[PDB]
Amino acid sequence: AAWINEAAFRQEGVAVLLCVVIAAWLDVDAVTRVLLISSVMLVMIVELLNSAIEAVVDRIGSEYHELSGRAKDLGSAAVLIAIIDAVITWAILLWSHFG
Amino acid sequence: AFRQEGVAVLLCVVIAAWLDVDAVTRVLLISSVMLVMIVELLNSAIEAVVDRIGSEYHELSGRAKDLGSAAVLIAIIDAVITWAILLWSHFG
Amino acid sequence: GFTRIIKAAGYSWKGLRAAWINEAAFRQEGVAVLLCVVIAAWLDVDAVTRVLLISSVMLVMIVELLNSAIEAVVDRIGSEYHELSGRAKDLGSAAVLIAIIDAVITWAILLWSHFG
Numbered sequence A: 001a002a003w004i005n006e007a008a009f010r011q012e013g014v015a016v017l018l019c020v021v022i023a024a025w026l027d028v029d030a031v032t033r034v035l036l037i038s039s040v041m042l043v044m045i046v047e048l049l050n051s052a053i054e055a056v057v058d059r060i061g062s063e064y065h066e067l068s069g070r071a072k073d074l075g076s077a078a079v080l081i082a083i084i085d086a087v088i089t090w091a092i093l094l095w096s097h098f099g
Numbered sequence B: 001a002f003r004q005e006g007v008a009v010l011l012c013v014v015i016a017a018w019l020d021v022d023a024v025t026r027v028l029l030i031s032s033v034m035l036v037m038i039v040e041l042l043n044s045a046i047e048a049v050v051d052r053i054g055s056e057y058h059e060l061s062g063r064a065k066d067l068g069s070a071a072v073l074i075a076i077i078d079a080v081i082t083w084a085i086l087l088w089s090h091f092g
Numbered sequence C: 001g002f003t004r005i006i007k008a009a010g011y012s013w014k015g016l017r018a019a020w021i022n023e024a025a026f027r028q029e030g031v032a033v034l035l036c037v038v039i040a041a042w043l044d045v046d047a048v049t050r051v052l053l054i055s056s057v058m059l060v061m062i063v064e065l066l067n068s069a070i071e072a073v074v075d076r077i078g079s080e081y082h083e084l085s086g087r088a089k090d091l092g093s094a095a096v097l098i099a100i101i102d103a104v105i106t107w108a109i110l111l112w113s114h115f116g
Ligand SMILES: CCCCCCC/C=C/CCCCCC(=O)OC[C@@H](O)CO
Pocket: C041, C042, C043, C044
């Protein structure tokens, strides 16, 4: 409900969205296509969960606590691992596809 | 309801075993369903925190539940795309 | 932008570092994950199987980190509200254990079909 109107989410969304379109056009087999799409959708999923966690922390207050920062650091780490999994997925699958 | 969610899993698992597909297709079909559960469980956990922070509404209280529900939505969508693509290929 | 990434990549490193430093269980988990990838990378399998073997154990790490974040929130709130902090932790722990089960099963089935 109107969270999709922030810049960072739009660039993240459009990046993921763009990959799904690309994956939908590539001449690959079904299992590869599913994996190409799954890897980038997971990034969007995890980022949504990371932002959701961040919302809960900011909800509590602006006064800083060590665990408040750590929850955000762990959420970011989850996204990073997701992004790496996506790059690796496309790397392994689309290697030697152009030729 | 996780009660119906659990039976929904079994049905997908039963169908997955029913169809004459190889191990890779079988792992993809079921994992996608399992990812929904994981995200839902994670979303439900986030919700449990929000609800005890306060019984009041806040800009950030409801913003979390939306982003969490969005994550579940994206997971369910990915699951449908997977079952569509694979079954289409299987019955090609 | 380019500077958003440096800032976000920095929080990620603090996340992984703090998670590593604070628990032996996490360190041993990261080792188990790291090995599994190395093994997956060297196996003589097709590209989709390779990705499946890698992708799954990665998901374990992802869910682990997300859950650890959620745990940090309920500990932040304090002792008083504990009981629904308990349910949030129970839910998140289910997500972690499910993901690990999926990883274990996936590796079993796939390595079975290949070596068998
Ligand atoms: C920084 C050095 C390591 C970086 C590794 C990243 C890309 C390489 C991945 C593994 C390639 C090394 C050979 C292992 C392997 O894949 O065996 C498969 C074999 O069937 C043909 O290569």
